[PDB]
Amino acid sequence: AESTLGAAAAQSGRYFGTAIASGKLGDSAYTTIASREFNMVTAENEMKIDATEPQRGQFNFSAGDRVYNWAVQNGKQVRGHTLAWHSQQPGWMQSLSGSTLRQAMIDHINGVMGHYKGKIAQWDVVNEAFSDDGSGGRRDSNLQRTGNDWIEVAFRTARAADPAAKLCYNDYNIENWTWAKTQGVYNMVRDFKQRGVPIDCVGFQSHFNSGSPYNSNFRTTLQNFAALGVDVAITELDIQGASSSTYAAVTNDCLAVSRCLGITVWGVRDTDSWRSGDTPLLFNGDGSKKAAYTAVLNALNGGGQIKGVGSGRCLDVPNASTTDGTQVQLYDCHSATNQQWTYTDAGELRVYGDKCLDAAGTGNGTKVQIYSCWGGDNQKWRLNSDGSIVGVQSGLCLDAVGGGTANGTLIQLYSCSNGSNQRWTRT
Amino acid sequence: AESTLGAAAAQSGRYFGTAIASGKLGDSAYTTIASREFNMVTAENEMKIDATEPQRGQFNFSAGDRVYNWAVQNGKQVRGHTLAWHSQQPGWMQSLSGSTLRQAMIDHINGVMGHYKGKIAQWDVVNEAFSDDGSGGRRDSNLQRTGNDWIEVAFRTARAADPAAKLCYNDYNIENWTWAKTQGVYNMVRDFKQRGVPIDCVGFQSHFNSGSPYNSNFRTTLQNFAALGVDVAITELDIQGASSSTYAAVTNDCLAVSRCLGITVWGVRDTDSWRSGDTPLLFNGDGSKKAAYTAVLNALNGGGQIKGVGSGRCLDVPNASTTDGTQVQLYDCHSATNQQWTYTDAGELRVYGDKCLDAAGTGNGTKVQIYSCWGGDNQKWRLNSDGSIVGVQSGLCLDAVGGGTANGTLIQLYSCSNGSNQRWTRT
Numbered sequence: 001a002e003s004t005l006g007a008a009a010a011q012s013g014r015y016f017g018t019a020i021a022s023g024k025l026g027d028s029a030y031t032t033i034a035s036r037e038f039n040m041v042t043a044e045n046e047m048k049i050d051a052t053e054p055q056r057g058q059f060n061f062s063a064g065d066r067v068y069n070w071a072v073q074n075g076k077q078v079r080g081h082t083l084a085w086h087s088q089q090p091g092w093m094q095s096l097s098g099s100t101l102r103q104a105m106i107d108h109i110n111g112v113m114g115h116y117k118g119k120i121a122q123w124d125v126v127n128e129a130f131s132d133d134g135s136g137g138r139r140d141s142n143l144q145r146t147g148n149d150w151i152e153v154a155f156r157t158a159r160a161a162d163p164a165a166k167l168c169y170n171d172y173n174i175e176n177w178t179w180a181k182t183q184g185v186y187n188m189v190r191d192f193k194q195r196g197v198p199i200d201c202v203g204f205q206s207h208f209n210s211g212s213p214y215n216s217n218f219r220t221t222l223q224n225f226a227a228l229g230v231d232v233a234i235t236e237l238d239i240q241g242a243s244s245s246t247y248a249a250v251t252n253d254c255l256a257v258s259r260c261l262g263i264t265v266w267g268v269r270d271t272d273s274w275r276s277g278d279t280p281l282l283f284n285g286d287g288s289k290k291a292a293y294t295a296v297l298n299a300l301n302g303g304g305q306i307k308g309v310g311s312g313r314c315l316d317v318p319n320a321s322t323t324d325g326t327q328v329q330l331y332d333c334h335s336a337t338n339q340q341w342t343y344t345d346a347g348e349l350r351v352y353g354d355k356c357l358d359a360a361g362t363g364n365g366t367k368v369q370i371y372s373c374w375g376g377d378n379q380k381w382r383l384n385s386d387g388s389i390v391g392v393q394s395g396l397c398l399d400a401v402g403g404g405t406a407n408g409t410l411i412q413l414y415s416c417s418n419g420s421n422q423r424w425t426r427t
Numbered sequence: 428a429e430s431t432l433g434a435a436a437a438q439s440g441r442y443f444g445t446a447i448a449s450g451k452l453g454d455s456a457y458t459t460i461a462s463r464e465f466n467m468v469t470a471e472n473e474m475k476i477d478a479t480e481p482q483r484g485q486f487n488f489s490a491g492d493r494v495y496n497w498a499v500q501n502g503k504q505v506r507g508h509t510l511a512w513h514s515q516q517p518g519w520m521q522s523l524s525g526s527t528l529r530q531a532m533i534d535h536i537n538g539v540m541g542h543y544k545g546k547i548a549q550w551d552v553v554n555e556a557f558s559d560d561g562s563g564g565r566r567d568s569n570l571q572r573t574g575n576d577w578i579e580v581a582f583r584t585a586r587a588a589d590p591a592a593k594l595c596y597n598d599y600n601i602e603n604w605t606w607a608k609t610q611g612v613y614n615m616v617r618d619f620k621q622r623g624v625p626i627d628c629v630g631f632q633s634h635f636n637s638g639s640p641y642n643s644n645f646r647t648t649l650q651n652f653a654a655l656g657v658d659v660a661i662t663e664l665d666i667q668g669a670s671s672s673t674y675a676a677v678t679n680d681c682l683a684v685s686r687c688l689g690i691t692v693w694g695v696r697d698t699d700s701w702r703s704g705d706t707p708l709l710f711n712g713d714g715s716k717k718a719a720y721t722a723v724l725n726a727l728n729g730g731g732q733i734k735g736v737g738s739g740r741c742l743d744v745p746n747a748s749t750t751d752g753t754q755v756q757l758y759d760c761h762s763a764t765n766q767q768w769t770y771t772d773a774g775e776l777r778v779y780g781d782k783c784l785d786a787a788g789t790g791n792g793t794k795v796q797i798y799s800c801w802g803g804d805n806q807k808w809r810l811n812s813d814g815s816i817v818g819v820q821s822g823l824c825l826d827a828v829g830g831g832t833a834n835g836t837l838i839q840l841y842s843c844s845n846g847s848n849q850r851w852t853r854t
């Protein structure tokens with residue numbers, strides 16, 4: 001298909017997944033979206049070290065299995081996250097050092113992979129082993145202190161435990177090619193491939209924001225690692241502000257690299273995010289598709305004035321007034337400011353620069369007007385490929401009242417029927 | 428003075444107040460802002476009918492007195508809210524009707540006003556007595572069904588109980604002069620003045636949103652009522668989106684009417700608002716001043732390129748770049764799009780139409796750059812009258828690194844110091 005992210009990604013042999021929290025599976029609003037849109041799942045915390053081995057040698061897969069069962073019951077594949085990591089270690093392991101820690105690491109890998117043997121598509125075997133101090137060197141942790149070869153040992157151990165799973169190294173801030181961290185990871189992978197250390201993929205977490213923005217050279221970064229003979233994947237994607245352009249850009253970067261397996265966004269709704277304050281996901285708290293959602297779907301599927309097809313007239317602001325509450329209408333198209341609409345990354349349709357197409361309600365017949373831009377979901381719109389314009393908050397379509405076609409026809413919100421008075425083209 | 432809203436309003440003999448909730452008087456962040464910025468207080472709920480007379484004849488002023496005492500002790504006058512209303516009536520009063528209710532109303536008025544006798548500046552004697560159906564007639568309530576003269580009776584009763592207080596009629600959706608409800612209220616007040624009914628003021632709640640937007644004819648409404656011989660007051664002001672222009676417009680409308688006693692915003696921080704979702708107030712959840720705050724203060728105190736005062740150079744985006752993460756600099760001024768910034772009502776400094784001046788952090792030395800506009804507080808700024816530009820989230824000033832003045836001097840956030848490398852002039 002091409003109406004859901006997962007199905008659209010499958011059209012190019014890829015997947016589109018999300019992170020699932022077992023504690024939210026009882027929320028039908030959560031699961032409805034999750035089961036429908038994604039075909040790949042990562043347990044947000046259920047498969048971490050502290051959750052799977054609470055006490056040394058005593059494994060517990062109850063939380064992890066709830067996530068796994070849900071995934072398979074709903075036709076999704078699973079990424080295992082994560083086997084060796086300096087963070088979120090259970091108390092007993094934090095107390096270990098030297099050879100004792102090294103063996104415990106090995107035992108943990110064998111224990112967790114044995115339970116899920118043959119059931120996991122990808123495993124983040126080692127997570128975040130590199131430093132952020134700009135040296136491009138290893139992060140200092142109890143694991144690194146057991147010996148520089150700890151990462152290699154983790155991978156060799158993993159391959160023996162379950163040779164059916166793809167083994168990935170996973171990290172953040174390794175997307176921009178110019179960073180020392182990115183290059184430090186590249187050299188490690190190169191070394192591993194030349195010495196025969198088993199590693200099949202590199203996961204780029206892809207947590208983008210103002211302090212660590214997406215950069216177009218990310219595509220060369222992906223190509224460079226791919227050239228080493230490993231697959232690559234975007235594993236924990238989220239973008240501060242959820243810019244439609246940036247979300248579409250990241251998607252196209254993966255689509256340009258044959259070795260890019262797929263994309264996983266780190267969560268379902270903004271409110272489920274570990275960084276909810278940054279509204280970095282594709283669905284808002286209400287479970288509504290955001291503007292970025294449409295941008296991603298359109299990219300996966302291959303992808304001024306606004307005139308209605310059924311009337312041939314343009315979206316117009318009466319008498320070119322700038323008064324809040326002025327309802328918009330259809331009118332003879334002519335290059336005039338009151339007919340110039342700018343679609344922003346946030347999904348707004350701006351006029352006069354600071355006025356926004358505004359929905360004064362969420363029900364059928366709601367008046368569509370202009371109002372000072374402030375960022376509300378009632379000022380957010382999704383421009384579907386079928387030519388329809390849907391309001392993020394209401395889920396309703398821009399509709400020319402009564403199918404009218406003459407000048408003065410008013411614009412409202414109405415159930416989407418894909419009628420001709422609901423289709424628009426940008427010129 | 429002129430550094431706080433209350434003091435700035437007092438310069439013209441007016442006041443600037445807020446609604447206080449007794450439940451928050453324990454929050455030091457709440458009280459710090461409230462005691463400092465306002466010189467007028469309205470109890471948000473504590474003086475309502477259900478709060479002051481839980482059981483017929485049994486009066487309770489515990490919560491009301493708590494708000495009143497805090498107000499007076501901190502130098503603020505108080506508006507009483509409210510004596511007669513169809514909403515929030517206690518259980519027992521909802522059952523009454525006919526003369527029984529009329530008497531209950533009278534007793535309540537005498538009871539409440541007797542307790543606060545001579546301590547209240549203004550009383551909202553009657554609240555929201557008109558309909559929103561569009562007819563411009565009385566609202567059908569248990570009070571109205573006791574006799575069309577109940578309002579008159581309430582005002583006559585109130586005057587006798589405490590002749591020192593100004594008696595106001597309070598309502599919403601009566602700001603736009605062309606509305607039928609506005610006309611209904613007007614006709615009533617005009618009638619009351621002719622027949623000697625004691626009414627001293629008319630309160631305009633001023634709850635503006637895209638459903639009932641601010642209109643410039645609000646000033647005309649205020650002047651028309653003032654012409655009848657009554658004072659006017661903006662009693663529960665909040666604006667969906669908190670547009671800087673609209674907040675300034677409302678403030679100026681009051682300053683342009685000699686009988687406009689003052690303005691009361693319905694709450695302190697957005698998180699304290701009954702409509703927090705609309706972020707309609709002057710301070711955000713963090714308690715920091717919003718862009719609209721500065722606009723209001725500037726209005727009360729009387730009343731493109733961004734050029735650095737100390738350097739004579741302009742805020743410039745290097746090579747007219749549009750990539751996120753690009754740090755801005757100082758450069759010889761010249762009419763180019765990468766030097767034209769638009770200050771939006773939301774408080775953003777936009778360039779290229781959809782890129783925002785962005786702070787990648789909150790501490791000193793934080794890099795100031797451009798990033799996709801998404802509405803974060805790190806993309807909001809306050810243009811102070813002194814020439815400084817302060818980040819809303821950080822409370823820090825735009826600063827030309829090391830006081831540099833040559834082309835290429837980078838911009839950062841830094842503790843405000845009133846230095847020339849921190850003062851700007853819009854051209």
Ligand SMILES: OC[C@H]1O[C@@H](O)[C@H](O)[C@@H](O)[C@H]1O
Binds near residue numbers: 318319331
């Ligand atoms: O319908 C009134 C008309 O007023 C004109 O000034 C404007 O250019 C037209 O686009 C239309 O708005």
Ligand SMILES: OC[C@H]1O[C@@H](O)[C@H](O)[C@@H](O)[C@H]1O
Binds near residue numbers: 400401414421
């Ligand atoms: O009432 C408004 C509606 O009227 C219908 O006749 C029309 O087909 C819809 O698209 C919408 O315009």
Ligand SMILES: OC[C@H]1O[C@@H](O)[C@H](O)[C@@H](O)[C@H]1O
Binds near residue numbers: 763765
């Ligand atoms: O120093 C870089 C300069 O590059 C120029 O192309 C631009 O017009 C200047 O405003 C400045 O950005």
Ligand SMILES: OC[C@H]1O[C@@H](O)[C@H](O)[C@@H](O)[C@H]1O
Binds near residue numbers: 827830841844846848
């Ligand atoms: O190092 C940064 C600081 O350098 C100072 O010389 C300057 O006065 C400050 O405003 C700030 O720029």
